[PDB]
Amino acid sequence: MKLSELKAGDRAEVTSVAAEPAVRRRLMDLGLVRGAKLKVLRFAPLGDPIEVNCNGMLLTMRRNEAEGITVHILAGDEGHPHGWPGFRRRHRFGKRALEHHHHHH
Questions:
Q1: To 10 degrees, the CA torsion angle through 73, 76, 81, 85?
Q2: Given CB 3.0 to 4.6 Å as the disulfide criterion, which of 6, 19, 52, 103 pairs with 23?
Q3: Do the domain assignments include residue 97?
Q4: Which SMART domains match (predicted)?
Q5: What is the CATH number of the domain that holds 32?
Q6: How far apart are the first and last CA of the chain?
Q7: Tally of structural domains, the chain
Q8: DSSP one-letter string for 57-71
Q9: Strand order through the sheet with 69-73
Q10: Positive or negative CA dihedral for 35, 36, 42, 47?
């Protein structure tokens, strides 16, 4: 689910951010990381950008950036609360497999 798929006043926790390496870094340096809780304050009077209150900090980013961001709703309501199978079992070949060599080669 996208961060852009939220509502004005919605409450979500960031699970993953798919964006520019520098942008994701910038956001995470602010505090928008996995586990960051944010409230969607408002979208601009036209559609973009979006103002979100993340961990107390008002972070302003572009709607297309919010599309890259996957969030989890901080509201366990009903009305079909289960979607795709990736919360109890999540397996896909990916990630930097060699988790050690970042400065080498």
A1: 60
A2: 19
A3: no
A4: FeoA
A5: 2.30.30.90
A6: 35
A7: 1
A8: EEEEE-HHHHHHEEE
A9: 57-61, 50-54, 37-43, 11-17, 69-73
A10: negative
Three-state SS at 22: helix
Method of determination is: NMR
Tokens standing for residue 21? 């390496």
Q: Enter the tokens of residue 46.
A: 């036209």
Q: Which domain holds residue 40?
A: 1-83
Amino acid (1-letter code) at residue 104: H
102 inside domain: no
Please tell me the distance from the alpha carbon of residue 86 to that of residue 10, in angstroms, as a whole number.
Answer: 22
Amino acid at the residue 82: H
Joined tokens for residue 54: 């993340």
36 CB contacts (<8 Å, ≥6 apart)?
13, 14, 54, 55
Cα distance between residue 15 and residue 37, in whole Å: 10
Determine the Cα–Cα distance for residues 56 and 67; give it in Å rounded to an integer.
Answer: 22
For residue 86, what are its two tokens?
């990736």
Identify whether 101 is part of a domain: no
